Amino acid sequence: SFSGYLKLTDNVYIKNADIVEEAKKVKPTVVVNAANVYLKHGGGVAGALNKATNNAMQVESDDYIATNGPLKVGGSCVLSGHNLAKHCLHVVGPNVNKGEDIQLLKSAYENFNQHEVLLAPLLSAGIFGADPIHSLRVCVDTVRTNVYLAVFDKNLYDKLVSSF
Numbered sequence: 001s002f003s004g005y006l007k008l009t010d011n012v013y014i015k016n017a018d019i020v021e022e023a024k025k026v027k028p029t030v031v032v033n034a035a036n037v038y039l040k041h042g043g044g045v046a047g048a049l050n051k052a053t054n055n056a057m058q059v060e061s062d063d064y065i066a067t068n069g070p071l072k073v074g075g076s077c078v079l080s081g082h083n084l085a086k087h088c089l090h091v092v093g094p095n096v097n098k099g100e101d102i103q104l105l106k107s108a109y110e111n112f113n114q115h116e117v118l119l120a121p122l123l124s125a126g127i128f129g130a131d132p133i134h135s136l137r138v139c140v141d142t143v144r145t146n147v148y149l150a151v152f153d154k155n156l157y158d159k160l161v162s163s164f
C-alpha cells in the first residue's frame, strides 16, 4: 500500500511526507518512532505520533517504563501501533544536542533488521541534531529489510535526493 516513493536502493525507498499522515493512509505492520530512552513523546516525530493516538501511546509507554526502566541509546522496544499501525517500533538514535555518541546511529538502525517492512523517519535527524545526509547513508549501509522513509521537510527531501 506504499505509493509515490522514490527508489534509492534494492530495499530503501523515500518520500516527502508527514509520517503520521502516511501511517493513517497505509496502516503499515510497523511504524518506527524516533524515541528517547524515557519514551517521553514530546516533540518531533514522537510528539506527532503520540498526538495522533490521542495520548494512548504515552499511557502505554509510561507503563512500559514503570515495568522495565529506560531503553539504551541505540536500542528499541516493540509496542502497540494503536490506530496508526499494527506495531510501533520505538528506536532511540543518539541525540547530538544532548551529547550522545553518533557511532550509536548504526546500532539504532540495526533494530530495523528484525522487521520485514517498516515505515520510518530518518533517525537522529530534526531536533536530535545529527546531519540528515549522514543518517540516510547509515540507513542504506545498515538496513537489509524493506524500509519506506518519510521525510517531512520538502527542502531537506530535495537535498537528500540530489546528494545521494
Ligand SMILES: O=C(O)[C@H](CC1CC1)Nc1ncnc2[nH]ccc12
Binding pocket: 044, 045, 121, 122, 125, 126, 127, 132, 150, 151, 152, 153, 156
Ligand atoms: O524533515 C524531517 O524528516 C526531519 C525531522 C523532523 C520531522 C521531525 N527534519 C529535519 N532534519 C534535519 N535538519 C532539518 N532542518 C530543518 C528541518 C530538518
